[PDB]
Amino acid sequence: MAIRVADLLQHITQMKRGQGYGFKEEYEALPEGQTASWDTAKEDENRNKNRYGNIISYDHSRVRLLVLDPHSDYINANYIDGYHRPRHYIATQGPMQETVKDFWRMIWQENSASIVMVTNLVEVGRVKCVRYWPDDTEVYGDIKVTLIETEPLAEYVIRTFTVQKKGYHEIRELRLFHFTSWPDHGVPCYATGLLGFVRQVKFLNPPEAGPIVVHCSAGAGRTGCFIAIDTMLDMAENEGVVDIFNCVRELRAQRVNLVQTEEQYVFVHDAILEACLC
């Protein structure tokens, strides 16, 4: 069911014409809600580690933390396969006050070099994510994080840090790619800025490092869009085809409801098309 890149404009058009099979039906065919077990996530002892009760971590794909407390192994995060590479990303919720330390522990544990943040901290008066990075230097658990560079651009900001587990000698470099123009449950007016942002991550992420951590507020909608676009550009570049429906289907098998609205699903298509034209 793959679509030739050469045929993508025609496909998207046909899919936007209300007259035959289109995006509403296609989106409605994606599996909605829970499709696999999440027994650990729904443990009483882990309720306060989950931001949204409906978007919690499937057992098969969940990122397990070293146990410190038998329930210390839980974070609301899942490995997500990329095009080339299994466990290429971790999709997770935006940290909560309670989970900031767990978040940095996962980063250390997993050898992650990149964080992709596709939310603002507050949106229309609602907290979406707690600030989990320092203005200067801060210790989260025993993870010491120091800001070394800020690069502001029009629709996003890249912040670079050193990261060190206290009492050990390794000092790592990490980048936080923070996209600032994408509203929760919404989509950007244009794909262009987001595509530049994607291009930066692909350019700068060290491929020898651990998974790229991707998060929004719940870790489904905008997180899923970023992952879908990123993956499909790899597929397009390599095969001259994209299969966005099975991509998002596969995304949902690994973590519930990634790409959370029809408008987002359509936006993923528009963004991939633009990248392919360019």
Residue numbers in the entry: 889 to 956, 959 to 1168
Task: Give the authors' words.
Protein tyrosine phosphatases (PTPs) play a critical role in regulating cellular functions by selectively dephosphorylating their substrates. The ∼280 residue PTP catalytic domain consists of an α/β structure, and biochemical and structural studies have led to a detailed understanding of the catalytic mechanism (Barford et al., 1994; Zhang, 2002). Key features of the domain include the PTP signature motif, the mobile Trp-Pro-Asp “WPD” loop that in the closed conformation positions the conserved and catalytically important aspartate residue, and the phosphotyrosine recognition loop. Here we report the crystal structures of 22 PTP domains, including two tandem-domain RPTP structures and a detailed structural comparison of this protein family.
The second-site loop assumes a twisted conformation in these phosphatases. This architecture is present in the subgroups NT5 (PTPH1, MEG1), NT6 (PTPD1, PTPD2), R1 (CD45), R2B (RPTPμ, RPTPκ, RPTPρ), and R4 (RPTPα, RPTPɛ). In contrast R1 group members (e.g., CD45) and R2B group had a more than two orders of magnitude lower enzymatic activity, suggesting that enhancement of activity by tight association with substrates in signaling complexes may be important for efficient signaling.
